[PDB]
């Protein structure tokens, strides 16, 4: 006579995953659902990125001289750097956050 065997495959290197009943259990393959890394660069496409360089958005708005390059500019995303500084008459904006927001949003 003959013998017929039913079987399933297996692999040398398996992967531990987590289930309802099981904290670690080995399967043949798994895929990662959490992105943990970055290339490190803000990609200039496909969004119009405006690098503010030494300028904050508010100074660009007001017209601080060293910001005058930003006149009439547009952006999808305005990037403010930490090195930014104000060179003009010292001022303050009550509810600075809101002006910043609504201008940033107007774009």
């Amino acid at each position: 006579g003959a013998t017929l065997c039913l079987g399933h495959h297996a692999v040398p290197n398996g992967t531990l995953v987590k289930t309802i009943t099981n904290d670690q259990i080995e399967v043949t393959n798994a895929t990662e659902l959490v992105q943990s890394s970055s290339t490190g660069k803000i990609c200039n496409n496909p969004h119009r990125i405006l690098d503010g360089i030494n300028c904050t958005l508010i100074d660009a708005l007001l017209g601080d001289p060293h910001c005058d390059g930003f006149q009439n500019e547009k952006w999808d995303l305005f990037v403010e750097r930490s090195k930014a500084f104000s060179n003009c008459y010292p001022y303050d904006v009550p509810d600075y956050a809101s002006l910043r927001s609504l201008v940033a949003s107007s774009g």
């Binding site: 017929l4 039913l6 297996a10 692999v11 659902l33």
Partner: protein, 171 residues
């Protein structure tokens, strides 16, 4: 799993089977052989993909949102902004943990299921001409050459042909 086939009554997997997820090994007069079952392999892969595509699907696009970091202590409103963001993150972190747990449990169970379904399909084909050896192998009580084994694998096996022989050898 839940059907008790994989890591079940089937002792272990075959690292040697590289052309499919599920298959047959046989031994008969002519020698030993191995072949993958592509339909059930496909069933498993299809399901897993379906689910993979459910989850890996397009993310949500968001543009202007609330501020999530603060350089000054402001009290109440910042307390609220912070609390809202923290709440959101906790809830999604929960959804994700659970999605993975459920999904994985189910994948394990469905792959077990496919195995068991192949076994069952085969047993049913063989009718009275074979016995379940409990290890996931059938004992075939008639003379089965490579063509015959093949006929079992592609689903064309005619049991009535060998029934007399097999019946004879079983008892």
């Amino acid at each position: 799993g839940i059907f008790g086939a994989i890591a079940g009554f089937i002792e272990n997997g075959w690292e040697g089977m590289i052309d499919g997820w599920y298959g047959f090994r046989h031994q008969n007069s002519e020698g030993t052989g191995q072949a993958a079952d592509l339909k059930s392999t496909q069933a498993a892969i299809d399901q897993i993909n379906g689910k993979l595509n459910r989850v890996i699907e397009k993310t949500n696009e968001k543009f202007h949102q609330i501020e999530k970091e603060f350089s000054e202590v402001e009290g109440r409103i910042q307390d609220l902004e912070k609390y809202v963001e923290d709440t959101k993150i906790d809830l999604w972190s929960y959804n994700a943990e659970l999605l993975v747990a459920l999904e994985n449990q189910h994948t394990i169970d469905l792959t077990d299921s496919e195995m068991n379904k192949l076994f069952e399909k085969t047993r049913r084909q063989l009718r009275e001409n074979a016995e379940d050896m409990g290890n996931g192998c059938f004992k075939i009580y008639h003379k089965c050459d490579n063509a015959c084994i093949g006929s079992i694998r592609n689903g064309t096996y005619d049991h009535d042909v060998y029934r007399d022989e097999a019946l004879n050898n079983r008892f």
